[PDB]
C-alpha cells in the first residue's frame, strides 16, 4: 500500500535518492537542459522549481545560501543561481521549468524526458503546438463564439 506516498524510491535509499536528484539538479543549473529517465526528471522537477524560489531570496539570505551550497555541488553555479537564474524569473511566480517526454533510449528502452530552465540561450525544443485557429473545427467554434457575443450584448 502506497496511499499518499508522494516521493519515489530511487538509488540505494533515502540519502542516495537525494544525491541522485542533487546531481541531476546540478547538471540542469549548469547546462539549463538535460535529458534523463522520465521518472527521475519528474522526481527532480520539484526541486528544480523550489531552487529558483530560494535563489529569489537573495545571496544575502543565509538560509538560501545554505540551500544552494548543499544542492549545488559545483560552487561556481551558486553565483549563477542568485545572479542569473533568479533574476531571469523575477517576474514569473512559477513554471520555471518545462518537461517533455522524448523517445525511449536505445540501450534499456527507458522512458526518457528532457527538462530545461525556461529562457535559456539553447535552441528551442520542438514544443507541441495546438492546432491552428484557422482550422475547420476552430473556425466553426470561432463563429459560435462571435454569435454568443451578439446574444450577450442584446
Amino acid at each position: 500500500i502506497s496511499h499518499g506516498r508522494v516521493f519515489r524510491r530511487m538509488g540505494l535509499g533515502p540519502e542516495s535518492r537525494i544525491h541522485l536528484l542533487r546531481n541531476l539538479l546540478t547538471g540542469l543549473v549548469r547546462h539549463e537542459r538535460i535529458e534523463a529517465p522520465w521518472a527521475r526528471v519528474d522526481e527532480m522537477r520539484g526541486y528544480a522549481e523550489k531552487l529558483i524560489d530560494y535563489g529569489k531570496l537573495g545571496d544575502t539570505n543565509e538560509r538560501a545560501m545554505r540551500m544552494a551550497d548543499f544542492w549545488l555541488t559545483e560552487k561556481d553555479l551558486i553565483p549563477k543561481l542568485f545572479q542569473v537564474l533568479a533574476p531571469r524569473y523575477k517576474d514569473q511566480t512559477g513554471g520555471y521549468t518545462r518537461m517533455l517526454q522524448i523517445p525511449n533510449r536505445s540501450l534499456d528502452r527507458a522512458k526518457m524526458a528532457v527538462i530545461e530552465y525556461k529562457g535559456n540561450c539553447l535552441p528551442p525544443l520542438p514544443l507541441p503546438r495546438r492546432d491552428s485557429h484557422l482550422t475547420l473545427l476552430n473556425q466553426l467554434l470561432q463563429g459560435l463564439r462571435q454569435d454568443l457575443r451578439q446574444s450577450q450584448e442584446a
Binding site: 549548469r30 547546462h31 537542459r33 559545483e74 560552487k75 561556481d76 553555479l77 553565483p79 549563477k80 545572479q83 542569473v84 531571469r88 517533455l100 517526454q101 522524448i102 523517445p103 528532457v114 540561450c121 539553447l122 535552441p123 528551442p124 525544443l125 520542438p126 507541441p128
Partner: protein
C-alpha cells in the same frame, strides 16, 4: 516442484498465442508536420529532437572554449550569434557565443 507431465504443443500454443501475449497495435502514431517523420502524439519527434540536440552540442562545445576550464560558469546571460549577425541592444552585456554557421530557420533570434 518438478512438472508432472510434458506440456503439449497444443496447450503451449494456447498459452503463447493468447491475445494477452500478442503485441498491441498502436494508434497514437502520427506524422511530424515539420520534418514529415513519424512520432507519437505525446512524445517529441525523434528526428526533430536530434536536430536540436546536434546544434545544442555544437553550441555547448563553443561555450567550453570560451570558459576554458572547469568551475567557470559565467554570472551573466548567454546569447548565441550566427554568422552575419551583430549583438542586439537587448543582447548587450551578455556572453556571446559565435557559431560558424547560418542561423537555422527553426532557431529564431529573439
Amino acid at each position: 516442484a518438478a512438472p508432472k507431465n510434458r506440456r503439449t504443443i497444443e496447450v503451449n500454443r494456447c498459452r503463447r498465442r493468447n491475445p494477452q501475449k500478442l503485441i498491441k497495435v498502436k494508434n497514437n502514431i502520427d506524422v511530424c508536420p515539420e520534418c514529415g517523420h513519424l512520432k507519437q502524439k505525446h512524445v517529441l519527434c525523434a528526428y526533430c529532437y536530434e536536430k536540436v540536440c546536434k546544434e545544442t552540442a555544437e553550441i555547448r562545445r563553443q561555450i567550453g572554449k570560451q570558459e576554458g576550464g572547469p568551475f567557470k560558469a559565467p554570472t551573466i546571460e548567454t546569447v548565441v550569434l550566427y554568422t552575419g549577425e551583430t549583438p542586439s541592444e537587448q543582447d548587450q552585456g551578455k556572453r556571446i557565443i559565435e557559431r560558424d554557421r547560418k542561423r537555422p530557420s527553426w532557431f529564431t533570434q529573439n
